[PDB]
Design a protein around this ligand. Structure first.
Ligand code: 6M3
Ligand code: ZN
Length: 221
């Protein structure tokens, strides 16, 4: 008696509670992100961030863009958020002249599209390719990333080599005049002779983040 109607109501309750849960999670993430963004811990610690988690969707799009330029460098922007000492990259878009209003209005539509599925994301960094010479920051890249870690903070610099296996680097510049201790050669990389000077000189003005990769529930399609 009312067994059929009970099943429908139970399904409806299950669906209504999922939506409410999604909204609650988004709102908790938003306030938790507004907390750290107003706190700015990265301004005091210079080795604050240590990890970079990249979604398979963001990697797919970045590698596709990188390949499309062939021998020529390519760049774009990354969407994500902060989680303690970890920079999370969830999505990315290619770049791209009156003004870069397009790069600003694209960014807003990605955040909005993600909001609909209950995903909290914002501009977290920039990516670019080094076709054939490896993952590191050139002198021009270090000057760019130092300025980014002033005006665009929190901001990460991803470098992809689409020619040679999983050749991706995630980096953070140190501030002008900051002398850090210890040694950081980590993984060995074969870079050309005509780039080794630019490499070795600036190779201490920044550091590498520990890159990890993840597939989200939404990043399965
Ligand atoms: N913001 C910033 C910015 C800074 C530098 C570059 C270029 C520049 O140095 C030229 C040599 C190759 C290079 C290797 N790494 C960086 N670059 C770029 C750049 C500009 C157009 C297309 C692709 C990129 Cl990657 C952007
Ligand atoms: Zn570069």
């Amino acid at each position: 008696s009312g067994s059929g109607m009970a099943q429908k109501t139970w399904e409806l309750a299950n669906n209504m509670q999922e939506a409410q849960s999604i909204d609650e999670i988004y709102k908790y993430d938003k306030k938790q992100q507004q907390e750290i963004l107003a706190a700015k811990p990265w301004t005091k610690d210079h080795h604050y961030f240590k990890y970079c988690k990249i979604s398979a969707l963001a990697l797919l799009k970045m590698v596709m863009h990188a390949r499309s330029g062939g021998n020529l460098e390519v760049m774009g922007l990354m969407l994500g958020k902060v989680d303690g000492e970890t920079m999370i990259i969830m999505d990315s878009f290619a770049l791209p002249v009156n003004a870069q209003a397009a790069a600003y209005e694209y960014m807003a539509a990605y955040i909005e599209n993600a909001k609909q599925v209950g995903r909290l994301e914002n501009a977290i960094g920039w990516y670019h390719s080094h076709p054939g010479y490896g993952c590191w920051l050139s002198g021009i890249d270090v000057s760019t990333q130092m300025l980014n870690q002033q005006f665009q903070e929190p901001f990460v610099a991803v470098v992809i080599d689409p020619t040679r296996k999983v050749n991706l680097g995630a980096f953070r510049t140190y501030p002008k005049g900051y002398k850090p201790p210890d040694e950081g050669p980590s993984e060995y990389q074969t870079i050309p002779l005509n780039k080794i000077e630019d490499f070795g000189v600036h190779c201490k003005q920044y550091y590498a983040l520990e890159v990890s990769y993840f597939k989200s529930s939404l990043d399965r399609k």
